[PDB]
Design brief:
homodimer; alpha+beta; Catalase HpII,  Chain A, domain 1; Hemocyanin, N-terminal domain; ten-stranded antiparallel sheet; binds protoporphyrin IX containing FE; iron (chains A, B); oxidoreductase (chains A, B); Catalase easC (chains A, B)
Chain lengths: ~400, ~400
């Protein structure tokens, strides 16, 4: 029966590899509308003209587990926006946390493997995560951030989105500035709770919206700042912490609102291809090493997952060149004082911004995680934590030793 | 940096497609030991000689969801055993339920799609399952069976395994018989509860064991039985139901016991390839259409999932030929009286083997599912259920109409 063989052969070739990271996700469609004037810093045609409208497609996701896993676990959430303009698609691959774990792109597979299930039993492994954290001290900021309530608080509608990098916005005269934009949720602070919530909201006629803002830094003032704006593991301070770092102001650009979901999930959402290399006229990448790695990695990954196999910029001074040359040196992969300064200030500022219960919950979550690892790794964890704050390490250890 | 590009390229090509069905699973190693004499019905070298021992490899799994999904959901569980004998690998691809949903292999993709998430929202869909059941009346037996406690009762250690087909065991003189073997659990009746249970049991020195039994049917007595032994949607009665069908006796063969888990899950368990076409000397397939489809489907599926792309039998009488010719006819895909007889007898015998609470639980489980489908499909479900038993349909409808 050739017909039965044809049916079975077509059925046998349906599934394709899932994404290396952010495998589980959901999609929707909407539009972007320009509401403010940014013509003095921008020349992108999509953002020129108040009331201009551009169609878009969005894909929300989780981070570390597989396609069928849960969405209410402690993790980072992603939001990838594809915009169809008059010059081509322009992609915004964003995260819901202002910073990232590492700053050296060569450490990415180790971080991903440390966040993946046990290589032998396919079960959860906190030990790999804590060993990675104790070996890499630039992940301390993100680790302290993720064990607060922020790691288990957002769904797809209440989460925000940060591009986390620096880009260059070039004017027609050859000048440019360092920029960083993000989206602020208008409606925010079972393995499919977030997916169900988003689709029910879209069904009941309520259209979620986001506010888009941009922060601008002059190239000649970047070398004189108190932190490296090319270091993706740090964040541009907007008013919370650290107190001694001046605030970088923001302007408003437009608004993004979502209307209608997918009709075929696999064809329209799963097989979508995003990449930071998708740019338009007026925007170029910065000198971030991780951005340079991402400019290559995404098309290469899509060649395997979706493959057939199944204006000259102006020149700056010598100070800018010296400041930029730091990203390619032996010391770039070694910790500095800021790697301990950022989590320390976050810990010190938690009680004032949220209260003592927030801090206590962070301590409890850290201890519950650390209670499942061997004793020597526990001692290493306490020693590493004492570098951020003595009180934090003391409390975490005193509360962990009563739970083993 | 060629080194960074090499690292990222190697990382980008790690994941491969998952299996079309039974994507989530666990593995272990053990051995099979022959304890009884079957030399009068068997010529397979693996089963000749008491005390003979053969290495083994097992892969347990769930049925309908993806790799990262849960294992405590209502589903069918599989157990695939690979044996390394002196003539080659011999595979036993088994299920934990004595029968299967359908009887015509051409309906397999529709059943699989009806059991898969919603094609547009990627959420659960009972409506597709109930529409499929109402369109195909040979799945009523399995549907009634699966909504009892048996659908949410077993883990990987307490579950049993049935090959569910008929095979031919050929003697050196050219004679043969129809056989059907199975494994009886010696120790039985969060998305990784069964996996964790199995690995913890293997970590404490307790080795799970299974008992292997065989049922033998003479070729000349098969045409005169009350049920088609070539129909995979029916089961060989061992003493429970139906009362009016005589019991087919069983003999003992050996025992299978498991010792050691995997060292690398992805390389040793995930990339394992099973197929009913893996046979040895002394065993040949029967005339089952679904078995014939499975003999082709599995290597074809493995060509895509794991591909480089990322003794003459004796002749029987005319009665046997006439009885065998039924599997290739227009009436094979249409329901008969037995498709309603089997679920009716199971329902009628449920009060006698487990009690009335078992029956009530089945009714409640059915109605919770039927409460989530539109009204016309509900009416169709009640009409279809009334063909098995009027009381069952009446109770299910009276309980469902109070929950919508
Ligand atoms: C060296 C650093 C990184 C590498 C090599 C990397 C690599 C990848 C790869 C290979 C994918 C799969 C995309 C596909 O197959 O289409 C992916 C997805 C994704 N990554 Fe990155 N990543 C890095 C860091 C980051 C950063 C800094 C962010 C956010 C600021 C991020 C956010 C995301 C998101 C949101 C997705 C989901 C895209 C989608 O839904 O298709 N990753 N990443
Ligand atoms: C026309 C009928 C059927 C077809 C076409 C079919 C097809 C498949 C396919 C394509 C796979 C994936 C295997 C691989 O990619 O290596 C699979 C796996 C499996 N099937 Fe079937 N199936 C059918 C009926 C059955 C029956 C009757 C049983 C049990 C009696 C069964 C039990 C299993 C099990 C346990 C696995 C897991 C194998 C593993 O762990 O690798 N299926 N099936």
């Amino acid at each position: 029966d050739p017909r039965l063989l044809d049916i079975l052969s077509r059925f046998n070739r349906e599934k394709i590899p899932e994404r290396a990271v952010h495998a589980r996700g959901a999609g929707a469609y909407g539009e972007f509308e320009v509401t403010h004037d940014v013509s003095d810093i921008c020349d992108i045609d999509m953002l020129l003209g108040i009331g201009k409208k551009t169609p878009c497609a969005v894909r929300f996701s989780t981070t570390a587990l597989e396609r069928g896993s849960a969405e209410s676990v402690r993790d980072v959430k992603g939001m990838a926006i594809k915009l169809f303009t008059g010059d081509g698609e322009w992609d915004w691959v964003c995260l819901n946390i202002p910073m990232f774990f590492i700053r050296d792109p060569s450490k990415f597979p180790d971080l991903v493997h440390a966040q993946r299930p046990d290589p032998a039993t396919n079960l959860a492994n906190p030990a790999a995560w804590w060993e990675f954290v104790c070996n890499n001290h630039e992940s301390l900021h993100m680790a302290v951030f993720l064990f607060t309530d922020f790691g288990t608080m957002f769904d797809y509608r209440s989460m925000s989105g940060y591009v986390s990098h620096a880009y260059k916005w070039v004017m027609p005269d050859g000048t440019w500035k360092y920029v960083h934009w993000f989206l602020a949720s208008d409606q925010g602070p079972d393995s499919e709770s977030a997916t169900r919530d988003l689709y029910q909201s879209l069904e009941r006629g309520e259209c979620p919206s986001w506010t888009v803002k941009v922060q601008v830094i002059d190239p000649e003032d970047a070398p004189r700042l108190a932190f490296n704006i090319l270091d993706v593991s740090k964040h541009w301070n907007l008013g919370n912490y650290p107190p001694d770092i001046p605030v970088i102001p923001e302007r408003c650009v437009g608004k993004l609102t979502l209307k209608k979901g997918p009709e075929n999930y696999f064809e329209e959402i799963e097989k979508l291809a995003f990449s930071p290399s998708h740019l338009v006229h007026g925007v170029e990448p910065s000198e971030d090493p991780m951005l340079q790695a991402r400019l290559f990695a995404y098309p290469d990954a899509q060649e395997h997952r979706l493959g057939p196999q199944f204006v000259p910029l102006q020149k700056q001074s010598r100070e800018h060149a010296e400041w930029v040359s730091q990203v390619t040196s032996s010391s770039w992969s070694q910790p500095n004082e800021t790697d301990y300064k950022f989590p320390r200030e976050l810990w010190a500022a938690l009680p004032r911004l949220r209260g003592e219960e927030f801090q206590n919950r962070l301590v409890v979550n850290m201890a519950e995680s650390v209670s499942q690892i061997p004793e020597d790794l526990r001692q290493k964890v306490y020693k590493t934590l004492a570098l951020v704050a003595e009180d934090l390490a003391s409390r975490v250890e005193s509360l962990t030793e009563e739970m083993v």
